[PDB]
Scaffold this active site. Structure first.
Site, PDB file in Angstrom:
ATOM      1  N   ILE A 136      20.535 -20.744 -42.979  1.00  0.00           N
ATOM      2  CA  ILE A 136      20.416 -19.313 -43.197  1.00  0.00           C
ATOM      3  C   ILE A 136      18.995 -18.770 -43.143  1.00  0.00           C
ATOM      4  CG2 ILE A 136      22.541 -19.237 -44.522  1.00  0.00           C
ATOM      5  CD1 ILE A 136      20.826 -19.224 -47.056  1.00  0.00           C
ATOM      6  N   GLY A 137      18.025 -19.633 -42.875  1.00  0.00           N
ATOM      7  CA  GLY A 137      16.707 -19.134 -42.550  1.00  0.00           C
ATOM      8  C   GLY A 137      15.619 -20.164 -42.699  1.00  0.00           C
ATOM      9  N   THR A 145       7.764 -20.773 -44.391  1.00  0.00           N
ATOM     10  CA  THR A 145       6.471 -21.394 -44.141  1.00  0.00           C
ATOM     11  C   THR A 145       6.454 -22.848 -44.600  1.00  0.00           C
ATOM     12  OG1 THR A 145       5.796 -20.202 -46.150  1.00  0.00           O
ATOM     13  CG2 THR A 145       4.931 -19.402 -44.040  1.00  0.00           C
ATOM     14  N   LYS A 196      16.940 -25.560 -49.777  1.00  0.00           N
ATOM     15  CA  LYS A 196      15.720 -25.598 -48.988  1.00  0.00           C
ATOM     16  C   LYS A 196      15.226 -27.021 -48.804  1.00  0.00           C
ATOM     17  CE  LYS A 196      12.073 -22.780 -48.246  1.00  0.00           C
ATOM     18  NZ  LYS A 196      10.730 -22.135 -48.340  1.00  0.00           N
ATOM     19  N   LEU A 200      21.902 -15.984 -52.971  1.00  0.00           N
ATOM     20  CA  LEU A 200      22.077 -14.537 -52.873  1.00  0.00           C
ATOM     21  C   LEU A 200      22.407 -14.335 -51.404  1.00  0.00           C
ATOM     22  CD1 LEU A 200      21.537 -12.742 -55.335  1.00  0.00           C
ATOM     23  CD2 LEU A 200      20.148 -14.771 -55.459  1.00  0.00           C
ATOM     24  N   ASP A 223      18.820 -10.591 -47.847  1.00  0.00           N
ATOM     25  CA  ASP A 223      17.398 -10.407 -48.162  1.00  0.00           C
ATOM     26  C   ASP A 223      17.053  -8.928 -47.954  1.00  0.00           C
ATOM     27  OD1 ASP A 223      16.418  -9.756 -45.449  1.00  0.00           O
ATOM     28  OD2 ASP A 223      16.713 -11.861 -44.964  1.00  0.00           O
ATOM     29  N   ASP A 229       2.782 -14.447 -52.344  1.00  0.00           N
ATOM     30  CA  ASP A 229       3.251 -14.125 -51.010  1.00  0.00           C
ATOM     31  C   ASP A 229       4.470 -13.208 -50.982  1.00  0.00           C
ATOM     32  OD1 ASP A 229       3.382 -14.027 -48.320  1.00  0.00           O
ATOM     33  OD2 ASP A 229       4.024 -16.118 -48.051  1.00  0.00           O
ATOM     34  N   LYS A 243       7.013 -10.669 -49.943  1.00  0.00           N
ATOM     35  CA  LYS A 243       7.494 -10.051 -48.708  1.00  0.00           C
ATOM     36  C   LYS A 243       8.960  -9.662 -48.868  1.00  0.00           C
ATOM     37  CE  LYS A 243       7.035 -13.603 -46.730  1.00  0.00           C
ATOM     38  NZ  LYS A 243       6.646 -14.962 -46.291  1.00  0.00           N
ATOM     39  N   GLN A 288      11.377 -10.601 -47.247  1.00  0.00           N
ATOM     40  CA  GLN A 288      12.244 -11.761 -47.052  1.00  0.00           C
ATOM     41  C   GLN A 288      12.376 -12.643 -48.286  1.00  0.00           C
ATOM     42  OE1 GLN A 288       9.130 -12.152 -44.856  1.00  0.00           O
ATOM     43  NE2 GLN A 288       9.795 -10.064 -44.399  1.00  0.00           N
TER      44      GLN A 288
HETATM   45  C1  LIG Z   1      16.519 -15.690 -47.991  1.00  0.00           C
HETATM   46  C2  LIG Z   1      17.773 -16.409 -47.574  1.00  0.00           C
HETATM   47  O1  LIG Z   1      17.432 -17.417 -46.766  1.00  0.00           O
HETATM   48  C3  LIG Z   1      18.646 -16.799 -48.672  1.00  0.00           C
HETATM   49  C4  LIG Z   1      18.246 -17.571 -49.829  1.00  0.00           C
HETATM   50  C5  LIG Z   1      18.940 -17.628 -51.172  1.00  0.00           C
HETATM   51  O2  LIG Z   1      20.066 -17.160 -51.311  1.00  0.00           O
HETATM   52  N1  LIG Z   1      18.288 -18.150 -52.204  1.00  0.00           N
HETATM   53  C6  LIG Z   1      17.049 -18.464 -51.599  1.00  0.00           C
HETATM   54  C7  LIG Z   1      15.872 -18.976 -52.273  1.00  0.00           C
HETATM   55  C8  LIG Z   1      14.653 -19.083 -51.483  1.00  0.00           C
HETATM   56  C9  LIG Z   1      14.604 -18.680 -50.085  1.00  0.00           C
HETATM   57  S1  LIG Z   1      12.922 -18.533 -49.455  1.00  0.00           S
HETATM   58  O3  LIG Z   1      12.379 -16.979 -50.044  1.00  0.00           O
HETATM   59  O4  LIG Z   1      12.370 -19.959 -50.259  1.00  0.00           O
HETATM   60  N2  LIG Z   1      12.470 -18.446 -47.738  1.00  0.00           N
HETATM   61  C10 LIG Z   1      13.399 -18.921 -46.703  1.00  0.00           C
HETATM   62  C11 LIG Z   1      13.868 -17.781 -45.818  1.00  0.00           C
HETATM   63  C12 LIG Z   1      12.711 -16.970 -45.239  1.00  0.00           C
HETATM   64  O5  LIG Z   1      13.111 -15.944 -44.322  1.00  0.00           O
HETATM   65  C13 LIG Z   1      11.749 -16.516 -46.340  1.00  0.00           C
HETATM   66  C14 LIG Z   1      11.316 -17.651 -47.261  1.00  0.00           C
HETATM   67  C15 LIG Z   1      15.805 -18.362 -49.339  1.00  0.00           C
HETATM   68  C16 LIG Z   1      16.977 -18.171 -50.179  1.00  0.00           C
HETATM   69  N3  LIG Z   1      19.967 -16.296 -48.629  1.00  0.00           N
HETATM   70  C17 LIG Z   1      19.968 -15.515 -47.452  1.00  0.00           C
HETATM   71  C18 LIG Z   1      21.089 -14.857 -46.809  1.00  0.00           C
HETATM   72  C19 LIG Z   1      20.771 -13.984 -45.690  1.00  0.00           C
HETATM   73  C20 LIG Z   1      19.393 -13.756 -45.290  1.00  0.00           C
HETATM   74  C21 LIG Z   1      18.303 -14.561 -45.814  1.00  0.00           C
HETATM   75  C22 LIG Z   1      18.637 -15.468 -46.892  1.00  0.00           C
END
Ligand SMILES: C[C@@]1(O)/C(=C2/C(=O)Nc3ccc(S(=O)(=O)N4CCC(O)CC4)cc32)Nc2ccccc21
Length: 274
Positions: A10-11, A14, A33, A74, A77, A118, A120, A122
């Protein structure tokens, strides 16, 4: 690690690629992660940093030199939310609520001497219940980076999170990034072209900042009425206070929660497309 089942990527990030995964044992859907003794002690401390407006760091799994950060999940974003709203924009009450929640999150972290660094869109995760949470507490985008960091300040304070949240606040009202720089000097200069090139007057000590250049062009400030229209005087006041060059005079989160702007704060729910 064998306790999880990756359902899909899902993403990323860094540090690492975030996957969505259900706990084979508890059914608990999480955000998995996949990312130094201090870089374990520090990240485990955050495990105890629990607040409603901070994404929950459920666990940390350092297995076979592979690091995994089991986070609460969650669905959406802020960046994708703001994108899904570019045509209409996020309603002001939701903008106000969000800023208010994040500021309560930040206030909690800041009270514990922990900075995100940081911030943002996202890293700001939302859910259908209307809340918003601070994800990935920062351990390639400069848009939201405070000027003291750009000017070479090494011991920047919690005030940096505020500047970011300010920039983010502006971007939600404007549906456009406030200071989208492609380089560090361009980032700084864009900030300059708007808030006016800082000087010893508005920012005592700025001139001694490591990366400060006596040769910086001298841009005159511009009114916030032109910066964040059509944000009302209450919000523009809060924004300007969150975007103050001098970190010491930059309003705190705790103080921000008590700004007249948050007088009529409510908790509206977004309309998520999941
Ligand atoms: C941000 C995330 O990847 C995500 C995460 C979640 O539910 N809990 C998280 C806890 C941490 C991160 S992150 O802020 O560590 N990260 C990865 C994604 C990136 O775009 C920004 C930095 C991602 C998620 N759910 C969803 C669902 C749809 C879009 C993006 C995301």
């Amino acid at each position: 690690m064998e306790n999880f089942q990756k359902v899909e990527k899902i993403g990323e990030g860094t540090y690492g690629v975030v996957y969505k995964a259900r706990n084979k044992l508890t059914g608990e859907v999480v955000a998995l992660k996949k990312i130094p003794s201090t870089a374990i002690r520090e990240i485990s401390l955050l495990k105890e940093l629990n607040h409603p407006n901070i994404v929950k760091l459920l666990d940390v799994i350092h297995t076979e030199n592979k690091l995994y950060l089991v986070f609460e999940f969650l669905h959406q974003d802020l960046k994708k939310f703001m994108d899904a709203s570019a045509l209409t924009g996020i309603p002001l009450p939701l903008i106000k609520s969000y800023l208010f929640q994040l500021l309560q999150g930040l206030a909690f972290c800041h009270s514990h001497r922990v900075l995100h660094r940081d911030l943002k869109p996202q890293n700001l995760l939302i859910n259908t219940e209307g809340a918003i949470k601070l994800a990935d507490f920062g351990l390639v985008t400069l848009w939201y980076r405070a000027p003291e960091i750009l000017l070479g300040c090494k011991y920047y304070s919690t005030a940096v999170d505020i500047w970011s949240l300010g920039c983010i606040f502006a971007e939600m009202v404007t549906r456009r990034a406030l200071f989208p720089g492609d380089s560090e000097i361009d980032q700084l200069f864009r900030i300059f072209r708007t808030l006016g090139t800082p000087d010893e007057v508005v920012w005592p000590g700025v001139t001694s900042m490591p990366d400060y250049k006596p040769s910086f062009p001298k841009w005159a400030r511009q009114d916030f009425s032109k910066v964040v229209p059509p944000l009302d005087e209450d919000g523009r006041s809060l924004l300007s206070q969150m975007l103050h060059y001098d970190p010491n005079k930059r309003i705190s989160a705790k103080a921000a929660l008590a700004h007249p702007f948050f007088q009529d704060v409510t908790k509206p729910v977004p309309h998520l497309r999941l």
